[PDB]
Amino acid sequence: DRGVNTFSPEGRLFQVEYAIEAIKLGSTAIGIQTSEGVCLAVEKRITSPLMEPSSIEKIVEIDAHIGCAMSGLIADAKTLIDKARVETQNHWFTYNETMTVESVTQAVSNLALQFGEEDADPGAMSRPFGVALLFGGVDEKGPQLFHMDPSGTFVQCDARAIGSASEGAQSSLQEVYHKSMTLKEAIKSSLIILKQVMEEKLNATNIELATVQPGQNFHMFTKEELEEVIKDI
Amino acid sequence: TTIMAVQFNGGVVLGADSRTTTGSYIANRVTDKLTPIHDHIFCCRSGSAADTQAVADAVTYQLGFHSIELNEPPLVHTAASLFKEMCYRYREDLMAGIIIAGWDPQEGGQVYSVPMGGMMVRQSFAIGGSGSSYIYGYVDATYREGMTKDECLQFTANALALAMERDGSSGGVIRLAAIQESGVERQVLLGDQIPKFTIATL
């Protein structure tokens, strides 16, 4: 047995490396950055038909211009999203403007290695957040997509996949994506790759689709408009 | 209240009155205002009786512990600095006018003044209290540079006698203290032993 802030002979913390392993058991999520918006796709993974599919939400809005997709431990993620929602409103209160996608991601990345036993507050963190996040939104620089992991290393991505079949979905994204594709092609490509990595067949009450574009605000696809892009199998 | 300390070649000569008043009534006509801190270091108290006594006991505790740690005879400058730190930090709470005078093997005879503000300055002679105001003219005219021990004893006694004569808050008994390498010797001037000064009558 050892402490939480213990370095390995390799050159990295144990608790952080085990938190990366925790994502590999979670559900898969695909995000694609386009010149005319950012789309986010995720599987609901319904265990029993008795459970309500509308209750399972893995894509949530931080602001009216930024959406976020989560993978791994859902319980720990909702603490990070709630903190991100406050930070956007704190910046709005002080500066009278909406935050950039990079700034919101950086704000969550500050709570990365803030765990410890000694020299900490009575209600401080004891373990890292085992959550991989996809920050997709539109600001003054345009449509942007960011990836974050338990280590706190955030980076801009054109196409990123996180979850159980992360290696299989990423390889499929490498051979389809190019710089000058459309948003309709981005939603189409994400769904074809999403059904390939799934164990259960793709359905309207099985997936979540959300698009953030320079035109309108954060939009959640309802069952009716989902079937409009599902008909093109 | 009248307190005095005069520096000479060997060491220092101290002097203080014996009157402490709570309004217009004497609470103590035998008050000893010459407080010992160390073997050769003394201080003169003026102002609030509760405040001055509490600081004097606190410096004795601080310097006593300090002298043992260094294993060296304490300096007069060191003792006056401990009075300075308490009088300046709590200047809005304490009413004190301390004159610290003593002897050390490194410098010799030293007289330091810590007034109401909390400042510290070395002087050849020092006067403090309520009755000291009346003898500013006498001390400035009578003081000679390079006075011997016996001359400083008479110089302090005369100045204190004139102060108690005019001031209502000052009176009673003159208490003198002479400090040198030999040690500390104190004497008490009684009723008729007081320096005689004529009262002008028609």
């Binding site: - | 006991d57 606190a58 004795t60 505790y61 006593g64 512990f65 043992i68 740690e69 294993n71």
Partner: protein, 244 residues
């Protein structure tokens, strides 16, 4: 069982299956790690302290190397064991002695100073966070009502008054030497108490040491002030020993 261990009874200050504190017992062996012996003898007129003054090389300044410490003008002590822990207990003793005179007005007795240090060292015995001090303090000084007082405190927390005491590597051998001198009726004067203290350190260790090899500190009735004899006065007692 006689020598049994369970859990962490040998690592932290907790009880063993028998009811013994091992970490406290190891602290007494830390006193013997210095390789020095202290002897204290009480007379009718004075309290005497004598200790080895080992100078292994000429590079060291001899005047700085000392185990004799001054706590008050009337109270002195000697330290045996770990020098780092020894000085820490002296600085604490100097604090408690000054605080007593400030709060209670009068000067602290030797009886109360040793009791206070024993109570502080008890906290180390009951708490597992810190190790007990690997040092031993032997206090001397004259109580203005009872007379000369000799006290000794342990890392365990035991304090007691003494007619004669010893501490260090050659502790158990020198304590037997004092017993033979006490049993016989002696006229304990200033010169008698000092010479008994020096011979004790000279017979057990078998050296016949120079004035620069030992340090002596006395407290007499006429002079209650703590004084170190130095090489000038220690030699005078040593040349007088080789007479009878």
């Amino acid at each position: 069982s006689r020598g049994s261990s369970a859990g962490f009874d040998r690592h932290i200050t907790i009880f063993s299956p028998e009811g013994r504190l091992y970490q406290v017992e190891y602290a007494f062996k830390a006193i013997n790690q210095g390789g020095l012996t202290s002897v204290a003898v009480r007379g009718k007129d004075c309290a005497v302290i004598v200790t080895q003054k080992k100078v292994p090389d000429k590079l060291l300044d001899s005047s700085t190397v000392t185990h004799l410490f001054k706590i008050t003008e009337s109270i002195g002590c000697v330290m045996t064991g770990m020098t780092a822990d020894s000085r820490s207990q002296v600085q604490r003793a100097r604090y408690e002695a000054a605080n007593w005179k400030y709060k209670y007005g009068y000067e602290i007795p030797v009886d109360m100073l040793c009791k206070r240090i024993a109570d502080i060292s008890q906290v180390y015995t009951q708490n597992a966070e810190m190790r007990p001090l690997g040092c031993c303090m032997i206090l001397i000084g004259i109580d203005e009502e009872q007379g000369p007082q000799v006290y000794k405190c342990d890392p365990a927390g035991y304090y007691c008054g003494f007619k004669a005491t010893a501490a260090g590597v050659k502790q158990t051998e020198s304590t037997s030497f004092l017993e033979k001198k006490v049993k016989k009726k002696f006229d304990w004067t200033f010169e008698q108490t000092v010479e008994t203290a020096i011979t004790c350190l000279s017979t057990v260790l078998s050296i016949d040491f120079k004035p620069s090899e030992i340090e002596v500190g006395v407290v007499t009735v006429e002079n209650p002030k703590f004084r170190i004899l130095t090489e000038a006065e220690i030699d005078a007692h040593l040349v007088a020993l080789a007479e009878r």
